[PDB]
Amino acid sequence: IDHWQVDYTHYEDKIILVWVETNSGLIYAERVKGETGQEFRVQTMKWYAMFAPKSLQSDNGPAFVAESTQLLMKYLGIEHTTGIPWNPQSQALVERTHQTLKNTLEKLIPMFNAFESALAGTLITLNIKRKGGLGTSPMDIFIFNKEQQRIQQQSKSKQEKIRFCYYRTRKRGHPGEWQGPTQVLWGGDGAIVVKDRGTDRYLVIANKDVKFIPPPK
Amino acid sequence: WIENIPLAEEEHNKWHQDAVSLHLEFGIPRTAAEDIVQQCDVCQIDHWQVDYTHYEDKIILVWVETNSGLIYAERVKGETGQEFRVQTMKWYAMFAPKSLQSDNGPAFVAESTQLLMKYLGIEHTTGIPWNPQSQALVERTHQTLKNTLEKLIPMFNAFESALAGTLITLNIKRKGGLGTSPMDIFIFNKEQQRIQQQSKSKQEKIRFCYYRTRKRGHPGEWQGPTQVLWGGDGAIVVKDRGTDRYLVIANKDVKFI
Amino acid sequence: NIPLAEEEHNKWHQDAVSLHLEFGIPRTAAEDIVQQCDVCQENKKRGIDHWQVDYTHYEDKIILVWVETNSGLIYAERVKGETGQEFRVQTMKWYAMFAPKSLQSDNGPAFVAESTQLLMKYLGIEHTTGIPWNPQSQALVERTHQTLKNTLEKLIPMFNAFESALAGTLITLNIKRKGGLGTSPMDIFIFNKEQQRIQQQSKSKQEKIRFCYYRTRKRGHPGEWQGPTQVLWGGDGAIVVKDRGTDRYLVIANKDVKFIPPPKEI
Amino acid sequence: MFNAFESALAGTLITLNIKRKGGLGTSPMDIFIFNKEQQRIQQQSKSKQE
Amino acid sequence: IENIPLAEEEHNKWHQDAVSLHLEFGIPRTAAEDIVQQCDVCQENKMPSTLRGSNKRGIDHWQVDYTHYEDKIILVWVETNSGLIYAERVKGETGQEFRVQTMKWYAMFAPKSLQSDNGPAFVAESTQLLMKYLGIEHTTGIPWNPQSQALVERTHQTLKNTLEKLIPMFNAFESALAGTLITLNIKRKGGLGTSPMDIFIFNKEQQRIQQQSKSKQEKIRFCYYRTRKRGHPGEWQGPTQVLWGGDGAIVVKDRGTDRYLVIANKDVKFIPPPK
Amino acid sequence: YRTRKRGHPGEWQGPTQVLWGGDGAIVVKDRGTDRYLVIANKDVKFIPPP
Amino acid sequence: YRTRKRGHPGEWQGPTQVLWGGDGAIVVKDRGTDRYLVIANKDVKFIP
DNA sequence: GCTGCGAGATCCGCTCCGGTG
DNA sequence: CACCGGAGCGGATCTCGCA
DNA sequence: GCTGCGAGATCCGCTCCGGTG
DNA sequence: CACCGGAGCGGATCTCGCA
C-alpha cells in the first residue's frame, strides 16, 4: 500500500510525470514543462496535497536523486529508493500503464481542446471508468486500502492476546531443532505465522511443528 | 502547600467532604486533613436502585447505583405514580442507565409506570432487596444523606438547594482510594461501554482480499479472494486455498476489496 | 515527545487540541506551548470546557439554556421566572451534574447579580459578563437555539409533561444527535474530560523533579550563585543541568549546588 | 515560509482537509472518505436497484 | 497546626533551623523542614554535604596524573582494581612525549580504558585519536576536582615518601624510582600477603576470554519474575532466561530496566526444558 | 564490594565468594542478611580464592 | 550490492563476486579501497 | 606547665497504624 | 490473625571549613 | 554525560594459657 | 574447678595531607 514508482516519459514533445501505485494500479498524470528538480518538487508538493503516500520508488534520474529533493521529501517523511529498473513485478505494470496512457491520450486529444483536459479525461478513464473483478476501479481499491490502514485496527490488535510457541525448520523432510520461542503472529488451522529470529522474515509453520506453550495458571 | 490549607479549611466548613478526598484534591497532608475532620464537630454496569425516604416531612426520591455508588436525589411532593413517571423520565433523559432495582412500592408496581419503562427500553425489576451488599450500601447512603441534609439545611435558603449541594458533596468531591468519585466511575463505565461498542462494531468486518506470491523476484499471478484475518506491519496473513495453509504477503502485493 | 511537539508546532502551527491528540503530550502543556509561540498568539481564549448562557422564551416559558463552545454539549431546563435566586438554584444543579472550567454570559439581571457572582466565585470558576463577540460562539449558540426550538415544536405533542418533552429534546440533541465517525456531544464531553483527568493523574504521579541553584568555578574561585534551573537528569556525585545563559548541557560537581523544591512560588 | 504561492495554497488545502478537524479527529477529507466508503457498498447494488 | 502562618513569619524574620521551631510550637518537623525548603535565605545559605564515591570500575581501567617532585616531571600510572602502579620520569609534559610513554605502556600491558584530568597532554586531539587508534576509551574528569584522581594522588604521596626513604642508597634517581616501584608493587602487601602484581596476574588469568566464550554450552532455562511491595507481588511480567540458579534466589535481567536483578526462588516458577 | 549504607558507595565490606560472573555485574552472598544481591562491576575487587 | 548511510541506502554497486556467505548477509570486496565489506541481503541483488 | 567542634542534611531503625495476603 | 511499609520519632553518620 | 583514599599507629576485643582465689 | 589478665591474633578507628 502507498508504494509508488516514478518514470519520466515524453508524449507529443510534452513531459508527463506519471505516478503508478504498484498494488491497486491507481494512476495520476500531469503535463510537465521540464524535468527540472524544482518543477518535480512542486509536482510532489501538489501530489502530497492530493494523496497520503508512505513509500516511493524511482530510477536514477537527476531530479529524483537531487539532494534538495531528497531533503524536501524526507521533510515530508517518506522513504526513498532509486536504481536501475530491475523488478519485473512493478516494471511490467509500469510499461503497461505507459502504453495504455499513450493510447488513451491518442484517443482523447481530438475530442478535448486542452492537452491538460485530455490527460485529465484519460486519468478519469484509467482510474474510475476502468474496472476489474466485481467492478472495482483502481481508485476504489486505493480508497478502500487507505480506509483499512487507520489506527483503530492496530488498536484492536494491541487489545488482543498473544501466545508463545516453539518452531522447527524442515529440510527434505528432516525436522530441525526446536527454536524460539517467538510470538505467534496469528493462530490458524494446521499452521501458524511466526518470524525467524535470524533472517527477520515472516514465516508460516505447520501446527505439527508447533509446541504451544501453556499460559500462566 | 500552606496557600491551600486555610482554603481547604474554608471549603470543609462549606461542604464537609472527606479527609482523604480533600487531601488528594488539594495536596494537603492527610494527617492535617484528619485533624481538621476531627476538630470539625459538624462532621462528627449502569445498574440502579431506588428507596423512598422521608426527611423533615418531605418525601425525597433517591436513586442508588450498585457498583459505582453514584446517587441522585430530588424532592418529590408524594409517591404518586404520575409524579414518579415525571421524575423517572427526567432521570432516563439525563442519565443513561441499563438496569434498575426497585422494591414492591405501588408507584413501581403500577402498570402504566411499567409500560413507560418498557417503552423507554429500560429493564424494571420489582422485589424485596435481599443482597447484603446492596442493602448495606443503601442504608449507608440513606444515613449519610440524612446526616448531610441536617448539616447543610441552616446555611442554604432553599430545601432544593440543600439537596443540590448535598448531591454535589456526595458525588463530585467525596472520593476514596485513588480519589475516583462515583460520578467518575460512572463516566468511566459509560466511556468504556462506548469503547466496547465501537471495538466490537469494527470487529465484525472480517473482509476479504487478493494476494500473490513472489518467486526469485519474478511476479506471480493474483490469487484469491481470501479473507483478511490478520494484518501486521508491512505484510498481512492470507489463506492458500490450494494447500490449505496460510501465507504472508507484503502490502504491495495484496488487493483488498 | 514535548520538544518534538514544540518543533512541530513552530513548524506547522496547528491547534492545541490537535497537538494533544497526535503527540499525547498534556493538554495544559500544549496550551502553554501555544501561548508561548508568538505565531499562534499574533492572530487568532477558551480551554477544554467553556460555557455560554442565553435564556430563551418558548411558548411563553422561560428556559435556562446552557451551551458549550468546543464540544457543543448543551443543557436546558424550564424556569418559572427570571429571578436571580431561581437562576442560582438552576446553576447549582448544573454544577452538581457538570464540572465547568469557564463560563460566559450576557448582561442579564441574574448574570449581573452580586450574590450570583459571589456564588460563582464560591464555586471557583471563571466567569465573564458581557456581549458575546466571538463569531464561533455566536454562530454555534444561534444554531443551538434554532435547533432546540425546532426539536421542542417537533417533540412536545407526544409527551404529556412539558418537562418530559424538554427531556426528550435534550436526549435527541445530546445522545441521539450524532455525526462524523459516530461522535455525539456527550460522547466527546466524556472523552475530553477523560483526557483531562488522566493528564492530571500523570502530572501528579509520574513526575518527580527537583530544582537547584548552581555556580561555576574559575581559577579555583567559586562564582556567584545563579538560576535557579531544573535538574534534568539527577545522578550520584554529579548533576546535569541547563544553563539559561548559554542554553547548553553542563556537568557540575555536587559540591557547588543547593537542592531546592520545584514548586517554589507555584 | 513557502517559496511559491501555489505551494502556500496547497499547504492550506492540506491542513484544512487533514490537520484541521474536530470531535474524535474527524477532518473534512476523512469524513469525505468515510461517506464515499458508505456510498460505494450500496452503489454496488444500486445497479440492480435502479 | 493553626500557628503555622506565625511560624512561617518567624522563619522569614529570623531564619532558625526547623528542629528548634518543631520543639517550640509543637508542629511536625516535616512541615518545618518543608518551610525551610520553600524559604529563600536558608535555601541560599544551606550547604550540600554529600558523600559521592570513586571510579574503581573494573579490570584494566586506570587513571594517571603528573608528578612535581624536586622540579622534575614524573609520570605515575596507577591501577584501581588490583592496585598495581608503574612510573617513569620524562623531561616535559608535551603531547608527543606523553604519546610515546602511552605507547610504551600499551606495549607493556593490555589496558582497556583510561581516566585523566584536564591536562593539555591528556586532552590533546592527537592523543585522543591515538587512544581511539588502539581502541581504548578515554574520558576526561570534571576540571578542578582532584578527588576524581584521588587514587593517583594517594599513590603520589606514598611514592614521594618512599623516594624520601630510598634516594640516598642508589646512584641514579631513575634507579631509585625503579626501587620504589618494586617496593610498592611487590613488597607492599597486606591482608593475605599478596602483591598487587599477583592480583593483576590472577585478574588477567580469569579475564582470559576462551573460558568465558566456551561457557555458553551450559544449559539455559527460562522463567518469569515479579516485584514485591509490602509483601504484595505484581503480575508475572515477561519471560527471561535464568542467568544463574542459586540457593533461594536466581539471577534475571529486566528489559524494562536494562540491568541485572535478583528474585527469591519463592517468586520464581521454573519453565521445563524442551523434551 | 561496597553497598549503599548511609549514602552513596560505602566502605568495603568483607570477603565473600563470587557465585556467578556476568557483564557489568556479579552476584554475591550477603553475610549479614543472608540474601543474594546484584552488584555492578564498578565496585568489585577480585581476589584469588585463598 | 549497495551500502546504507545513516539508514539511507546508496546506489547499487558491482558487479562483484560473492566472497563469503553468511546468515542474512554477504561479504563483498570494495573495488575502490580494496577491502572486504559486509552487506545485508536486503541490500544485495544476486546475479544469476 | 597542655588539648578540634558543631550547624546542617539526608537515611535509616523503628513503632503504632495501615493495607495486605 | 500474621506481615511489611507508612508515617512519625529519634538517633546515627557524612563532609566541610572556619581560623 | 559523573564520582576521596590509604599508610600508619595505638587500643581494644578476644581466645588459649596463665596465675589466682 | 571458676575467674581475669596475659599474650597473640585480628580487626576497629583516629587525624592528616597529598594534589
CA angle, E149 then E154 then E159, to 5°: 125
- 3-state SS of F1-50 is CCCCCCCCCCCCCCCCCCCEECCCEEEEECCCCCCEEEEECCECCCCCCC
Long-range contacts of E185-191 (CB under 8 A, 24+ apart): E185/E84, E185/E85, E185/E86
Measured between alpha carbons, how far is G45 from B217 in angstroms, rounded to an integer? 10
After which residues is the backbone of chain B broken at C–N > 2.5 Å? 44
Burial zone of B228 (CB within 10 Å; 0-12 exposed, 13-18 middle, 19+ buried): buried
Architecture of domain B47-198: 2-Layer Sandwich (3.30)
C1' (J7) to CA (F19) span, angstroms: 32
Identify the CA nearest to G23 among candidates G5, G3, G42, G47: G42
Q: What angle do CA A17, D15, A72 make, to 5 degrees?
A: 45
Q: What angle do CA A143, A146, A149 make, to 5 degrees?
A: 150
Contact in structure between C100 and C125 (CB atoms under 8 Å): yes
E125 Cβ neighbours under 8 A, 6+ residues apart: none
C-alpha cell recorded at residue C76: 436546558
- CATH: 2.60.40.10, 3.40.50.970, 2.30.30.10, 3.30.70.20. Which one for A163-213? 2.30.30.10
Exposed (0-12), middle (13-18) or buried (19+): which is C72, by Cβ within 10 Å? buried
How many Å from the CA of E191 to C1' of J13?
Answer: 19
Distances in whole angstroms, Cα of residue E141 to Cα of each of C241, C255, E63, E99, E105: 17, 15, 10, 19, 21
Task: Determine whether the distance from the CB of E56 to the nearest atom of strand I is below 7 Å.
Answer: no
Rounded Cα distance, B185 and B174, in Å: 12
Q: Torsion angle of alpha carbons A118, A121, A125, A127, nearest 10°?
A: 110
Q: What is the DSSP letter of C174?
A: I
Q: Which helix (H) or strand (E) holds C148?
A: helix C135-155
Amino acid identity, residue E99? R
Show the CA angle centred on residue E154, arms to residues E152 and E157, nearest 5°. 110
The Cα A102–Cα A87 span in angstroms is 22
E65: CB within 7 A of chain K nucleic strand: yes
Please tell me whether residue D13 adopts helix, strand or coil conformation: helix
Q: Do A141 and B255 touch (CB under 8 A)?
A: yes
Find how far residue B206's CA is from the centre of its chain: 32
> Is D13 in contact with D29 (CB distance < 8 Å)?
no
Asked if F touches B (at least 3 Cβ pairs < 8 angstroms), the answer reads no
Ordered alpha helix ranges (H), chain A: 37-50, 62-65, 67-76, 88-108, 115-124, 138-148, 151-159
Cα separation, C68 vs C140, whole angstroms: 9
H or E element, residue D5: helix D5-14
**B31 and E28: CB-CB below 8 Å?**
yes
3-state class of C129 per DSSP?
strand
What lies within 8 Å, CB to CB, of E209 at 6+ separation is none
Neighbours of chain F (3+ CB pairs under 8 A): E
Cα E164 to Cα E154: distance, rounded to the nearest angstrom: 15
CA gap C265, C222 in Å, rounded: 27
Residue B155's φ and ψ, nearest 5 degrees, are -75, -35
- Domain locations in chain E as residue ranges: 61-212, 221-271
d(CA A39, CA G21): 44
Q: Cα dist. A87→A92, B40, C262 in Å?
A: 9, 82, 60
Return the percent helix, strand and coil in chain A, to nearest 5.
40, 25, 35
Say how far apart CA E55 and CA E148 lie, in whole Å: 7
**Residue C175 corresponds to which cell in the numbers above?**
445522545
Which residue type is seen at B194? R
d(CA E64, CA E148) in angstroms, rounded, equals 11
Q: Which CATH class is domain G1-47?
A: mainly beta
In angstroms, the Cα distances linking D45 to D35, D42, D48 are 16, 5, 6
**Which of the 8 DSSP states describes residue A213?**
P
Pairing of the two strands E240-242 and A191-195: unpaired
Tell me phi and psi for residue A176, to 5 degrees: -95, 180
SS3 state at A126: helix
Q: Of B43, B69, B74, whose CA–CA distance to B58 is shortest?
A: B74
> What is the H or E stretch that residue D39 is in?
helix D28-49
Cβ-contact C237, E52 below 8 angstroms? yes
What CATH architecture does domain C50-201 belong to?
2-Layer Sandwich (3.30)
Residue A166 contacts E, CB cutoff 8 Å: yes
B197 φ/ψ angles, rounded to the nearest 5 degrees = -60, -50
From E130, E87, E131, select the one nearest E112 (Cα to Cα).
E131
Residue F14: C-alpha distances to residues B195, C134, C247, E197, F43 (Å): 59, 76, 47, 22, 13
Query: For residues A100 and A16, what is the distance between their CA atoms, to the nearest angstrom?
Result: 13
Among residues B255, B205, B229, B224, the alpha carbon closest in space to that of A192 is found at B229
Phi and psi at B59, nearest 5°, equal -70, 135
Distance CA A144, CA A142 (A): 5
Nearest of B154, B137, B143 to residue B42 by alpha carbon = B154
Cα–Cα distance for residue pair F48/G7, rounded to 1 Å: 48
Q: Is the distance from CB of F17 to CB of F29 less than 8 angstroms? A: yes
Chain K footprint positions (protein CB, under 7 Å): 17-19
Residue B46 and residue B96 in contact, taking contact as beta carbons nearer than 8 Å: yes
State whether residue C15 sits within 8 Å of chain D by CB: yes
Query: How far apart are the C-alpha atoms of C170 and C153, rounded to whole Å?
Result: 13
The residue written with cell numbers 576526561 in the block is E140
Give the position of cell 514508482.
A5
Q: What is the SS3 assignment for C252? A: strand
Whether A27 and A20 have beta carbons less than 8 Å apart is answered as: yes
Q: Please provide the CATH number assigned to the domain covering A3-154.
A: 3.30.420.10
Cell triple for E272? 521445563
Q: What is the 3 state secondary structure string of E34-79?
A: HHHHHCCHHHHHCCCCCCCCCCCECCCEEEEEEEEECCEEEEEEEC
Strand bridging mode B235-240 / B245-250: antiparallel
As a rounded value in angstroms, the CA-to-C1' distance for A18 and I2 is 78
What is the C-alpha to C-alpha distance for residues E141 and E116, in angstroms, rounded to an integer? 6
Q: Considering only CA atoms, which of D14, C11, G10 is closest in space to residue A53?
A: D14
Angle between helices C2-12 and C16-23 (to 10 degrees): 140
Residues G9 and G1: their CA atoms lie apart, in Å, by 10
CA dihedral G10, G14, G17, G21 (to 10 degrees): 10
Count Cα neighbours of B177 within 13 Å in the Cβ-side half-sphere.
7
Exposed e or buried b for every residue in C18-32, given b needs 16+ CB within 10 A?
bbbbebebbbbbbbe
Is residue C117 classed exposed, middle or buried when 0-12, 13-18 and 19+ CB atoms within 10 A define those classes? middle
Q: What is the three-state SS of chain B?
A: CHHHHHHHHHHHHHHCCCHHHHHHHHCCCHHHHHHHHHHCCCCCCCEEEECCEECCCCEEEEEEECCCCCEEEEECCCCCHHHHHHHHHHHHHHCCCCEEEECCCHHHHCHHHHHHHHHHCCEEEECCCCCHHHHHHHHHHHHHHHHHHHHHCCCCCCHHHHHHHHHHHHHHHCCCCCCCCHHHHHHHHHHHHHHHHHHHHHHCCCCEEEECCEECCEECCCEEEEECCEECCCEEEEEECCCCEEEEEEHHHCCEC
Which residue out of C71, C80, C92, C198 would a mutagenesis test of the B interface target, given it has the greatest number of B Cβ atoms within 10 Å?
A: C92
Amino acid at A100: T
Query: Cα–Cα distances in Å, from D14 out to A56, C15, D10?
Result: 20, 15, 6
How far is it, in rounded angstroms, from Cα G42 to Cα A81? 12
List of residues 6+ apart from B37 with CB closer than 8 A = B12, B18, B19, B43, B44
CB proximity B39 to E under 8 Å: no
Cβ D33–A140 below 8 Å, yes or no?
Answer: no
Task: Tell me the CATH number for domain C210-260.
Answer: 2.30.30.10
What CATH code would you report for E221-271? 2.30.30.10
Cell of D27: 477532518
Contact A114, A23 (CB under 8 A): no
Does residue A7 sit in helix, strand or coil? Answer: strand
- The Cα C103–Cα B129 span in angstroms is 43
d(CA C153, CA C173): 14
> Nearest Cα to C101, choosing from C202, C205, C200, C204?
C200
User: If you classify domain B207-257 with CATH, what class do you get?
Assistant: mainly beta
Closest nucleotide (C1' vs CA) to F5 is: H11
Phi (first) and psi of residue G4, to 5 degrees: -105, 125
CB B66 within 8 Å of CB B48: yes
Can you tell me the distance from the alpha carbon of B219 to that of B196, in angstroms, rounded to the nearest whole number? 42
| Protein fold of E61-212 | Nucleotidyltransferase; domain 5 (3.30.420)
C249 touches chain B (CB under 8 A): no
List strands edge to edge, sheet with B235-240. B230-231, B235-240, B245-250
